[PDB]
A paper describes a structure:
The pyridoxal 5′‐phosphate ([name]) homeostasis protein (PLPHP) is a ubiquitous member of the COG0325 family with apparently no catalytic activity. Although the actual cellular role of this protein is unknown, it has been observed that mutations of the PLPHP encoding gene affect the activity of [name]‐dependent enzymes, B6 vitamers and amino acid levels. Here we report a detailed characterization of the [name] ortholog of PLPHP ([name]) with respect to its [name] binding and transfer properties, stability, and structure. [name] binds [name] very tightly and is able to slowly transfer it to a model [name]‐dependent enzyme, serine hydroxymethyltransferase.
We serendipitously discovered that the [name] variant of [name], affecting the lysine residue that binds [name] at the active site, is able to bind [name] covalently. This observation led us to recognize that a number of lysine residues, located at the entrance of the active site, can replace Lys36 in its [name] binding role.
Residue numbers in the entry: 3 to 228
Write the structure that this text describes.
């Protein structure tokens, strides 16, 4: 049951924030609906969920248009997959968030292709904090430069950071990797304006990411099936 799983996840988020002294309201739940059918999002929507994440551009845009045409308003769509330049326009025209900015060129394309009547596309810069097997995300030593360049793009808005740590089963390592991300997030927050989003944590490392200071968890399996 999707509705039951939504309520179960929100309780686990709420408990995890409370245990480490944070308000549950600090944590945004991003329902990762990738590869799930639109009918499943429809249940989530009917269960009160508004923020959905997609990894593939055309699947996402098709869903976005599906619910726009039903006249469902109030939804927030996050693109959280890797973004190739030949699909940037669909993202720039349809999505509300993009978590996967790791090169200045993809950000400038999104900026140029974003219609002016839309709000600025909220973007996060993706850090490869701990994955040698991923060709996605930058190193922390490159963050200040990319952030400063992306910060001037007027049709974008730099909101913070995202990372997908290498899979890790040890809670100790989960927390320490997430802390590195929280530390970098806090440093960015000092100088840049409106830095409020640390996209960090999935089903299995939710608690350490919340304890470390994530503001947004990306949950798929625990809501929709694997
Ligand atoms: C499940 C699914 N939906 C949609 C797409 C749409 O492809 P793209 O993201 O390259 O537009 C893909 C393939 O990449 C996919 O695997
Ligand atoms: C960026 C991102 N977040 C979250 C998930 C899925 O999260 P979960 O482990 O709960 O299925 C994936 C999808 O495979 C992902 O690529």
């Amino acid at each position: 049951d999707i509705a039951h799983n939504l309520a179960q996840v929100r309780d686990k988020i709420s408990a995890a924030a409370t245990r480490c002294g944070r308000s549950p309201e600090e944590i945004t739940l991003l329902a990762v609906s990738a590869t799930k059918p639109a009918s499943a999002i429809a249940e989530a929507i009917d269960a009160g969920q508004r923020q959905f994440g997609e990894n593939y551009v055309q699947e996402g845009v098709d869903k976005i248009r599906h619910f726009q045409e039903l006249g469902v308003t109030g939804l927030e769509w996050h693109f959280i997959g890797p973004l190739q330049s030949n699909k940037s326009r669909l993202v720039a025209e349809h999505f509300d968030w993009c978590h996967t900015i790791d090169r200045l060129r993809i950000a400038t394309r999104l900026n140029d292709q974003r219609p002016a009547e839309l709000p600025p596309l909220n973007v996060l810069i993706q850090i490869n904090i701990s994955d040698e097997n991923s060709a996605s995300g930058i190193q922390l030593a490159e963050l200040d430069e990319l952030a400063a360049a992306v910060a001037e793009l007027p049709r974008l808005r730099l909101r913070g950071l995202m990372a997908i740590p290498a899979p890790e089963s040890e809670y100790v390592r989960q927390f320490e990797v997430a802390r590195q991300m929280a530390v970098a997030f806090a440093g960015l927050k000092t100088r840049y304006p409106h830095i409020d989003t640390l996209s960090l944590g999935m089903s299995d490392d939710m608690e350490a990411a919340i304890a470390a200071g994530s503001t947004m968890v990306r949950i798929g399996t625990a809501i929709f099936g694997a």
